[PDB]
């Protein structure tokens, strides 16, 4: 079912030189702006120690390391896990989730973003362990693009897991996320998009919506330039969700000119 066993951690003072490096660890963490305003806290006050492994692989605070191999740091504040990161990643995975999924400095499509990443990994690196040995959340499924075959059950159960506590996401967070990862990833991708970030929220509202109206594939299976603004902008967005622009809605079935006629109305 699910076996995690308690991590271990020895605290350090490392050479600035001695810490390796992971691509997919540094990836992962979306960039962001912290990274400009962490300085006026790094010039002025080392405080959070860094996140590395056994092998003294750098698993969480690649930014922060940069920094400082730039300002004539030559000792660093690290927390030393016992595990091997190549051989678990697992593991791995979860301290970053730990460390940057309750960082209040990250946008909530920014978690989300990340949350889905960690998500994906974990269902993959679960899913070997099958192959080496509440009911339509189960009927519905996905297959990542490793061949990893998953539903919206397994995969919520494995959200709270990550997060117990809720610390990060509320529970109909990680349901309505559980359900548009499997069902509809497309629409997902508005969400946990920098260049949208439309609300977690709406996007279920538009799930629901749709699927109401029988015409979730007519929706998805048209072209950015109407599906995007429809769902990106609010204009686009209450004529999907208002029944008085139903009839606009078949007719785009555009879009500016479309919201053209949502603003040239919106007078009265």
């Given amino acids: 079912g699910s076996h995690m066993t308690e991590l271990t951690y020895t605290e350090e003072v490392v050479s600035i030189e001695k810490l390796k490096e992971d691509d997919e660890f540094k990836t992962l963490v979306p960039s962001n702006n912290s990274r400009e305003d962490l300085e006026k806290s ?15 692989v750098l698993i969480d605070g690649y930014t922060r390391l940069d920094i ?8 660093v504040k ?18 970053i989730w730990t460390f940057n999924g309750v960082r209040r400095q990250l946008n909530k499509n920014e978690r989300l973003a990340l949350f889905q990443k960690i998500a994906d990994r974990i269902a993959k690196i ?19 693009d490793d061949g990893t075959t998953i539903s919206a059950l397994e995969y919520e159960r494995i959200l709270k897991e990550l997060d117990k506590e809720n610390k990060a996401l509320s529970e109909s967070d990680k349901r309505k996320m559980a359900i548009l990862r499997i069902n509809t990833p497309w629409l997902l991708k508005y969400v946990t ?13 538009i799930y ?42 078949e007719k785009i079935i ?15």
């Avoid at 099958?130 to 189960?138: A, P, S, Y």
Wanted: proline letters at 3%; glycine letters at 2%; charged letters at 40%.
């Fill in 126 to 144: 679960q899913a070997s362990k099958n192959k080496t040995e509440q009911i339509e959340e189960n009927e519905e499924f996905v297959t990542l």
């Fill in 68 to 75: 400082m191999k730039k300002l004539g740091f030559k000792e």
């Fill in 193 to 205: 998009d920098q260049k949208y970030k439309v609300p977690l929220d709406q996007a279920f509202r």
């Fill in 208 to 249: 629901t919506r749709v699927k109401d109206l029988g015409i979730l594939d007519k929706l998805k299976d048209l072209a950015p330039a109407l599906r995007d603004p429809l769902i990106t902008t609010r204009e686009g967005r209450k004529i999907i969700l208002n029944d008085e622009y139903r009839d606009l809605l």
């Fill in 254 to 268: 555009t879009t500016e000119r479309a919201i053209s006629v949502k603003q040239k109305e919106a007078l009265k």
């Fill in 78 to 95: 690290i927390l030393k896990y016992d595990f091997d990161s190549q051989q678990e990643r697992d593991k791995a995975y979860e301290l």
């Fill in 42 to 56: 790094l010039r002025e006050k080392q405080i959070f120690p860094l996140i590395a492994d056994r092998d003294y």
